[PDB]
Design a protein around this ligand. Structure first.
Ligand SMILES: CC[C@@H]1C(=O)N(C)c2cnc(Nc3ccc(C(=O)NC4CCN(C)CC4)cc3OC)nc2N1C1CCCC1
Length: 127
């Protein structure tokens, strides 16, 4: 099957606020995960046509990736930290559902998830 359009990243109709938690998610969390050695498969939507995986979007109906998350943060798409956290978690879950447990792609996601959880534990208080 062909690729779907990527996830929505900007909605001018959707209310916007800057907060220290959202700033942290972009400046610290997204930045640190992006730079990790294992980040590259997670930096853009899965191109299932290029990868010849016609079943990917038959199985994964809520795709997510860090390129999308970066743009969402830049476009003030999220009202709160939890909405952004959900997107990271969706990204990891998709990887765990689609791929055989223990495969290299899964180990990569697991490393990123461990780092993510460390940074979320250090999420600043709303202030
Ligand atoms: C979609 C399934 C899963 C996933 O969950 N995500 C997120 C993913 C995101 N991006 C990729 N990207 C690439 C994966 C492989 C290659 C590549 O070139 N592999 C070579 C093929 C020839 N071989 C001799 C050496 C290795 C390039 C990729 O992007 C340019 N793969 C992903 N995988 C993998 C898909 C194959 C296993 C799992």
């Amino acid at each position: 099957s062909m690729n779907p359009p990527p996830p929505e990243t900007s909605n001018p109709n959707k209310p916007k606020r800057q907060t220290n938690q959202l700033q942290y998610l972009l400046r610290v969390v997204l930045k640190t995960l992006w730079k990790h050695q294992f980040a590259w498969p997670f930096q853009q939507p899965v191109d299932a046509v290029k990868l010849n995986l016609p079943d990917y979007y038959k199985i994964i109906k809520t795709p997510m990736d860090m390129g999308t998350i970066k743009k969402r943060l830049e476009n003030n798409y999220y009202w709160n930290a939890q909405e952004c956290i959900q997107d990271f978690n969706t990204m990891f879950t998709n990887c765990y559902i689609y791929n055989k447990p223990g495969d290299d792609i899964v180990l990569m996601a697991e490393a990123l998830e461990k780092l993510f959880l460390q940074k979320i534990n250090e999420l600043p208080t709303e202030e």
